[PDB]
């Protein structure tokens, strides 16, 4: 849907079937999915020493 | 959130005004917009039932 | 649902596509290997209070 931008009375909205870009035929599925890169190496303090 | 190695099956349908054979919303009609006070951006509406 | 975003007393109504090319103004889809453009003006003209 597309909502038309009247400078009109504010009590009403008119919606029209939007035509739309081709992407939206499957952006309607890919809303639920995100992709991430693992960062498997990390550092943190504790009280130990390497032996020398 | 759940991690997964692959998506569910997504079918490459093509259409303009109405979305066909795609996935239905879980409980109720859901309506999605990028920034709803902007007329240039389409509202996507996803149904709960199909309509045949 | 639209009533939640725009407010309960809004007189929401639908209308058909305004004008321009067949490909952008109509349903533009394939059935069975054949390409259909269909005039959705029958669906989109309800009005609500």
């Amino acid at each position, epitope marked *: 849907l597309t909502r038309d931008g009247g*400078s009109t009375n504010s009590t009403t909205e008119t919606f029209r079937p939007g035509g739309g870009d081709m992407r939206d035929n499957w952006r309607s599925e890919l809303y639920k999915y995100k992709v991430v890169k693992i960062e498997p190496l990390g550092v943190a303090p504790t009280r130990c020493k390497r032996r020398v | 959130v759940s991690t997964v190695q692959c998506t569910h099956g997504i079918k490459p349908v093509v259409s303009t005004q109405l979305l066909l054979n795609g996935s239905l919303a879980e409980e109720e009609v859901m309506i999605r917009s990028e920034n709803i006070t902007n*007329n240039a951006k389409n509202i996507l509406v996803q149904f709960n039932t199909p309509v045949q | 649902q639209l009533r939640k975003h725009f407010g309960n007393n809004t007189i929401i109504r639908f209308a058909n*596509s305004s004008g*321009g*090319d067949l490909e952008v103004t109509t349903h533009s889809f394939n059935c069975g290997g054949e390409f259909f453009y269909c005039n959705t003006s029958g669906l989109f003209n309800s009005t609500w209070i």
Partner: antibody
Amino acid sequence: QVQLQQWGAGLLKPSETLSLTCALYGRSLNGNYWSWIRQSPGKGLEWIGEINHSGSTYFNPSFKSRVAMSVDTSKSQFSLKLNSVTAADTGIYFCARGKRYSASYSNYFGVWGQGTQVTVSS
Amino acid sequence: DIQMTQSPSTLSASVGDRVDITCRASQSISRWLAWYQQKPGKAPKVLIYEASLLANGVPSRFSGHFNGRESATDFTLTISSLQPDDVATYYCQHYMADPRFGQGTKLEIKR
């Protein structure tokens, strides 16, 4: 019912400041921007800028160095001031209703005042 | 900035004729255009907005046309059956950015 009326200075000498008042009837300024537009026979129509009930503004770049606008939501009024007028500022000036706040692409001017004629001469 | 070119500059036709006025944006305006009628010595009045919708109180003989696609540049106002009252100056105007009017077209009736 919704309308505006406007008035102010008719004759100005060069380098003076123009000042014009616009008053609404039958509604408040909220929910819309408001603008001034002017006509001169050498240029057709020019948009000057815009204001709102919050008194924030945005101005057409060529005017931003000379223009000011103000609002008075208690009187249902807004106004325009234009510094350092020259013969080229001669014309008819109209205040008009602009875009509505909940529709970011709606800046086309639905209602206009009767307009006022400004002559800039000695 | 984005600027509007009208064509023709002046026009004449007789009562009951169709009349067409055109406007072209200097680059694509997605559909954010309006048309105005000005009587001599009066404020303009809006006729059409979003290139194609009628304003309220416009007689249904007025109409807008354009190719509909989101990259449009070329727009038309068609007076589908001219009447004695339609003698006026007509301006297009975009609102993609700052509002810019076209130079206006004048229509005078043949009798």
